[PDB]
Design an enzyme around this catalytic site. Sequence first.
Site, mmCIF file in Angstrom:
data_model
loop_
_atom_site.group_PDB
_atom_site.id
_atom_site.type_symbol
_atom_site.label_atom_id
_atom_site.label_comp_id
_atom_site.label_asym_id
_atom_site.label_seq_id
_atom_site.Cartn_x
_atom_site.Cartn_y
_atom_site.Cartn_z
ATOM 1 N NE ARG B 267 30.553 61.831 7.821
ATOM 2 C CZ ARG B 267 30.060 62.289 8.087
ATOM 3 N NH1 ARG B 267 31.062 63.086 9.172
ATOM 4 N NH2 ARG B 267 28.844 62.787 8.951
ATOM 5 C CD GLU B 269 39.029 64.737 7.825
ATOM 6 O OE1 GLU B 269 39.759 65.203 8.495
ATOM 7 O OE2 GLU B 269 38.039 64.501 7.870
ATOM 8 N NE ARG B 275 36.933 62.726 17.995
ATOM 9 C CZ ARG B 275 36.953 63.764 19.118
ATOM 10 N NH1 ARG B 275 36.277 63.526 19.831
ATOM 11 N NH2 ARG B 275 36.438 65.228 17.805
ATOM 12 C CG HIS B 276 38.077 59.736 11.147
ATOM 13 N ND1 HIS B 276 38.018 60.872 10.820
ATOM 14 C CD2 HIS B 276 38.181 59.026 10.064
ATOM 15 C CE1 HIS B 276 36.756 61.114 9.900
ATOM 16 N NE2 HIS B 276 37.573 59.515 8.979
ATOM 17 C CD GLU B 425 30.607 66.319 17.017
ATOM 18 O OE1 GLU B 425 32.115 67.474 16.679
ATOM 19 O OE2 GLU B 425 29.989 65.679 16.403
ATOM 20 C CB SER B 428 26.773 67.247 15.205
ATOM 21 O OG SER B 428 27.289 68.478 15.260
ATOM 22 N NE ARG B 476 34.190 60.088 17.665
ATOM 23 C CZ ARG B 476 34.086 61.414 16.684
ATOM 24 N NH1 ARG B 476 33.276 62.385 17.011
ATOM 25 N NH2 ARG B 476 34.810 61.335 15.257
HETATM 26 N N1 LIG Z 1 34.473 59.191 10.768
HETATM 27 C C1 LIG Z 1 33.350 59.049 11.972
HETATM 28 N N2 LIG Z 1 33.686 58.200 12.389
HETATM 29 C C2 LIG Z 1 32.489 58.141 13.580
HETATM 30 N N3 LIG Z 1 32.062 58.528 13.915
HETATM 31 C C3 LIG Z 1 31.864 60.106 12.735
HETATM 32 C C4 LIG Z 1 32.776 60.331 12.495
HETATM 33 N N4 LIG Z 1 32.559 61.571 12.449
HETATM 34 C C5 LIG Z 1 31.211 61.767 12.519
HETATM 35 N N5 LIG Z 1 30.980 60.810 13.332
HETATM 36 C C6 LIG Z 1 29.962 60.528 14.507
HETATM 37 O O1 LIG Z 1 29.316 61.062 14.218
HETATM 38 C C7 LIG Z 1 28.385 62.869 14.293
HETATM 39 C C8 LIG Z 1 28.329 63.605 13.765
HETATM 40 O O2 LIG Z 1 28.564 63.754 12.437
HETATM 41 P P1 LIG Z 1 29.272 64.956 12.320
HETATM 42 O O3 LIG Z 1 29.829 64.888 11.030
HETATM 43 O O4 LIG Z 1 29.241 65.867 12.713
HETATM 44 O O5 LIG Z 1 27.874 65.531 11.691
HETATM 45 C C9 LIG Z 1 26.715 65.537 10.782
HETATM 46 O O6 LIG Z 1 26.859 64.053 10.011
HETATM 47 C C10 LIG Z 1 25.412 66.130 10.231
HETATM 48 N N6 LIG Z 1 24.622 66.014 9.632
HETATM 49 C C11 LIG Z 1 24.697 65.945 11.185
HETATM 50 C C12 LIG Z 1 23.010 66.853 11.055
HETATM 51 O O7 LIG Z 1 23.815 68.405 11.819
HETATM 52 O O8 LIG Z 1 22.180 66.881 11.776
HETATM 53 C C13 LIG Z 1 29.317 63.081 15.811
HETATM 54 O O9 LIG Z 1 29.570 63.948 16.295
HETATM 55 C C14 LIG Z 1 30.318 61.693 15.859
HETATM 56 O O10 LIG Z 1 29.550 60.961 16.784
#
Ligand SMILES: Nc1ncnc2c1ncn2[C@@H]1O[C@H](COP(=O)(O)OC(=O)[C@@H](N)CC(=O)O)[C@@H](O)[C@H]1O
Lengths: 501, 502
Positions: B267, B269, B275-276, B425, B428, B476
Site C-alpha cells: 500500500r 498511500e 495502525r497503518h 476495523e 472488510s 491488526r
Molecule cells: N495499511 C494497512 N496496514 C495494515 N493493515 C491494513 C492496512 N489496510 C488495511 N489493512 C487491513 O486489511 C483489512 C482490509 O483491507 P481493506 O483495504 O479494507 O479492504 C480490502 O483490501 C478488500 N479487498 C477486502 C475485500 O473486500 O475482500 C482491514 O480491515 C485491515 O485489517
Amino acid sequence: KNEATKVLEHVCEDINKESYGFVKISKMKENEKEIRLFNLEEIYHSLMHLLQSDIWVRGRIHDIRSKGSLAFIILRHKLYSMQCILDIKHNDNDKNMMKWVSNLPLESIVDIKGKLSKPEVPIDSTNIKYEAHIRKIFCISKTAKELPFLLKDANMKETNEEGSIKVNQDNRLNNRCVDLRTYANYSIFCLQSQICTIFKNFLLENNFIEIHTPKLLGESSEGGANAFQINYFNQKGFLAQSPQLYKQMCINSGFDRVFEVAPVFRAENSNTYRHLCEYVSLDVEMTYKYDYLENVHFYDSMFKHIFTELSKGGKNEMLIKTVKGQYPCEDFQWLEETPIFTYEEAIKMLIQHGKLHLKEEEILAYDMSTDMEKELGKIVKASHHTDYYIIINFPSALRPFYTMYKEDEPAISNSYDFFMRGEEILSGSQRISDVNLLLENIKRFNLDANKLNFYIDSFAYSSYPHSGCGIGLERVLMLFLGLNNIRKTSLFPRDPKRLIP
Amino acid sequence: RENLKNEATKVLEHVCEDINKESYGFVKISKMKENEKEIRLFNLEEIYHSLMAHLLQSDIWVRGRIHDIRSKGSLAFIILRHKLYSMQCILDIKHNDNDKNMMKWVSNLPLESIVDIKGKLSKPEVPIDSTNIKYEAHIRKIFCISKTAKELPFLLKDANMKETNEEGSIKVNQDNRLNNRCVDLRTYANYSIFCLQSQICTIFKNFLLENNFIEIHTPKLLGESANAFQINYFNQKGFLAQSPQLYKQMCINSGFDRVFEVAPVFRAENSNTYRHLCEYVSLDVEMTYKYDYLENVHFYDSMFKHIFTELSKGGKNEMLIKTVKGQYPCEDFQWLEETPIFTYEEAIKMLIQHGKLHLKEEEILAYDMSTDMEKELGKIVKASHHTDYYIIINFPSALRPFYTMYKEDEPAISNSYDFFMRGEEILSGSQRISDVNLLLENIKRFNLDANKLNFYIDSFAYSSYPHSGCGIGLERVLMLFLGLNNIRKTSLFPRDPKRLIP
Ligand SMILES: Nc1ncnc2c1ncn2[C@@H]1O[C@H](COP(=O)(O)OC(=O)[C@@H](N)CC(=O)O)[C@@H](O)[C@H]1O
Ligand SMILES: Nc1ncnc2c1ncn2[C@@H]1O[C@H](COP(=O)(O)OC(=O)[C@@H](N)CC(=O)O)[C@@H](O)[C@H]1O
C-alpha cells in the site's frame, strides 16, 4: 418467430408454478426457500440416503445432448461429473421446455431438482455412477460469451497428429479462468494446496513458528542485478529475491526454528521452461547442536514425509490420477534412505558416463548446468532407482557469501541441493554464524558491507549455529508430477514476456 | 613492571583446546566432543516441560544465552535464557578446585553470549522469582560457543520493563527498538507476540481447510490498477498488488468454490499512523454461497469466534498471552456467543443518539467514519453489549468498491460488511457482483477503465457463481486482540513511509 424465441429466453417468475427458466437468485424461494442445495462433491462422497426422494443440485453444464424427447446433461463441479436427463417422462411433454434446455450454452450454471438412481450401465465419464432424472431445471448463470476454446478439447491428451486438436499454452494462459476448469488443472492446484499444508503441518509439529518478513527492501538480499527496483517514497529500494537475511535475523533473535511461505521476485531476463519472475518460496531456517547434518537429515525427513503424504490413498490418489490422465508420467519414486552424493562424486559420475570432460583440477571449478542436472538424474535413476537425491559439499566459490566453508578445506562448503527427477527443488547451507568470519567472506565476495549493515549487526550480539533452505513450491509440484513446464503449476504465471492476467 | 595484565588478558581470552581436561573457555563447535563421543545437549524448553527425569540424577549439558550475570565474590549467578524460559546457574569456586581463573573468565563474559554449561540440577530452598524454571544448575563446566562482539544498543533489562513513570525508569523508545530490531525481538513480550502471530495464521488456515477450502497463491506483480507502488517489469509498467481481490474472484469464477490466501500486500498511500503499514500480511477468503450471502457472513463470524476461542485456551497460548500482558497490560479480549450485528444506519444513529456525532439528515448516507469515531462506537458497544467484537453491515454503495453488489431493492445500500475488534476495523468484505453486465455497468458508474480490467471482467463472461469474500489484516488482528498501542509491535520488520530499514 417471436413465439419460439420467447420461450428460448424464458424467465421464470415462480419456481413452484413452473419447471424451467432463467431465474434470479432472489426468486429462488420454493416454499420459502427451504431448499437443501447439494453440490457434486457432496453427492460423490456420500454415494461413493440422499436417494430416497427428490433433491436439488447445482453445477455447470459441461456437455449437452438432445434428440427427440430425450436430453443428456453432463453436469460438472471441480472433479465431479454426473449425468442428468430430461426425457419429459414426468413433465407432461412440455416440449418448449426441451427447446429451452437444449439451447442452454455450455458452462452455464444450473440448479436442477431431480431424483437420483443408479443406471444399469453408467457413463464412463461421470465418476458419480448415479444419474438424475430432471423434475425441474433453472439457470442461475447463463454463459454470455463463446468460450475461447472448448473444454472437451482442452481436457484431451495431445495426440500430436498433423490436424490434431491442441490448445496452445499462450491461449490457455491468456484465458486462464477457463483453462483452470479442466480436470487436470483443477487437480494440479488442489495438489499445490496439499503440498503447502503438509509442509506447514510438518514444521509446526516439529516446533517451528511461521514468520512473515518484508518484500520491500532497501538492499539486494540475493544480488543486485536480478532485483526489481522500486521508488519507495523517494528512497531507492528493491523487491526481495528471498527472505534470506530476515529469516537469519530471526534465528539471531532467538526464534530457533522458523519457516515462511511467501512470494519472491526475480528479475533475471530468462525465458525457460522452469524459471518464473515471481514464485512462492517455502523457506526454513533453524539451529543445530553440533553438526549441520542434523538439519540436513531433518530437511530430508520433511521431503520424504511430503512424498509419503502425496502418494497415499484417498483424495490425493484421485487427484494425481486425474492429472496423469491428461499428462502421463510414471509415479514419483524415493528410497527408504535418501542417497547423498558429494558434488565431487556427482561430477565424477557425469565424467564416468562420458557426459562431461574435465581434468581433476577443474572439477571444483565446474558449475553444473540444468542439462547436466537432468543427465545426472538419469544416471541416478538407473543406478539407485529413485527420483529423489541430495548433493552436499558444493564448491565454496559457487555459493553465496553467507555459506560456511569447511575450515579445513575452504574450497568446499557445508551446502546442499535436493533434486527431484534430476532437477533442483531446494538450495541451502550451514550459515556463517561468526560476525568476523562473515565480514571476511563479504569482502572476499566484494560485497558492500554498508548495504548489509543491519543484517551483519544482527550477528554482533552472538549467533547460534544455524542452517536453512529455500524451496520452490511450483518446482516441487511440477517435478512430482513430471509436468513439462512450471507455468502448469503457477496459478497466474509471471515470466519476462507475461505480466497478464 | 606491570606486565601481569598480559597474563590476565590471556586468561580472559582463554581458548579451550580439550573440554575433557578443562572446565572453561571459548570453544569451536567442532571441539565439543566429550571423550570422543557426542554430548546429549538440552535446551531450556525441554527442561521446563520435563520439570514443571534423567535430568536430576547426574550432570547434564544445557545450552543457552546469558541473560544476566551477577558476580558475588566466590559465587557467580548466571541467568540462562531460551525463548520464554530462564534458569539460574551458579558457579561456586570452592566446588571448582579453588580456580580463580575460571571465575575471572566467567565474570568477564558479555551478556547475550551463548554458552554450553555442564552441571547438576537441583531445587533450591526458595527459587528465583524471575526464572520460570524453578531448578538451578550448579556449574561444573562452562564453554562459550559464541561471544557477544559489540556493546548492546540498549539493555534487555530496560527493554523488558513495563513502562512506568517511576524515578530512574529507563524507557527504550520505538525508533531505537525498530532500528535494533534483532535485539528488540529478544524481549519476552516480543517473542511471545510473534508466536501468537504464527498461532493466528495456523488457526485461520486449519479452520478453512477443515471446511474444505484450498490455499491459493496469486501474483503481486500486476499490470494495471494511484495508491500503488510502480515497477518497471521488462519495459512494461507494473504495480504491486494492494490486494489479491481480482485473482481470488477469478479463482471462484474458475470453479475453485472456496479459496484463501495468506500473503503480503503493498500500500503506497502516504499515511503515517499507529495502525497503518505500507506492507502487511493479508488473510483473504473468497467463497460461493447458495442463495443468501449472509451464509458466508455467518461463516466468517464463526471463523473469528473460533480464532478467539483457540487463542484463549490451553497452556501454551495462555503463557504467551500472560507474557505479553506482563509488559503491556490490557483486559482480556471479550466476545459473545452471539456476535452483535448492526446496520450502518443503526451504527450512525447510535453515535448520534450518544452525542458523539452530529450530522444533517441529508448527509446521513454520505458519511464515512473516522478511526476516532470507530473507537467511539466501540466504547458504546462495549458498554451496552459487553463485547469487544461486532459486525457492521449494509454500508452505502457509494462508499464501497466497484465489485460490491448493491441491494437491488435499494441500490444506495450494498451487501457489504466490516468486522471490529476493540472498536477498530479488522475485516472488510462483501457479496460480489457476479453478473458480468451489472459488473460492466458498475465499473462505468465508478468512472473506471474497463480495458484495464479486461482479464478480470472476462472471467465473469462464461458464467459466475454467486460469491462473497473478505480481507483481513493479520497484524491488526493481533494488535487489537492484545490491546497493543501500535501495529509496528505486531509486524516483524515494519514498513511505513519513513521506514524501509531493516
Ligand atoms: N495499511 C494497512 N496496514 C495494515 N493493515 C491494513 C492496512 N489496510 C488495511 N489493512 C487491513 O486489511 C483489512 C482490509 O483491507 P481493506 O483495504 O479494507 O479492504 C480490502 O483490501 C478488500 N479487498 C477486502 C475485500 O473486500 O475482500 C482491514 O480491515 C485491515 O485489517
Ligand atoms: N526463478 C525461479 N523460478 C522458480 N523457482 C525458482 C526460481 N529460482 C529458484 N527457484 C526455486 O527456489 C529454490 C531456492 O532458490 P535459490 O535461489 O537456489 O536459493 C535461495 O534463494 C537461498 N536463499 C536458499 C537458502 O540458502 O536458504 C530453488 O531450488 C528452486 O526450487
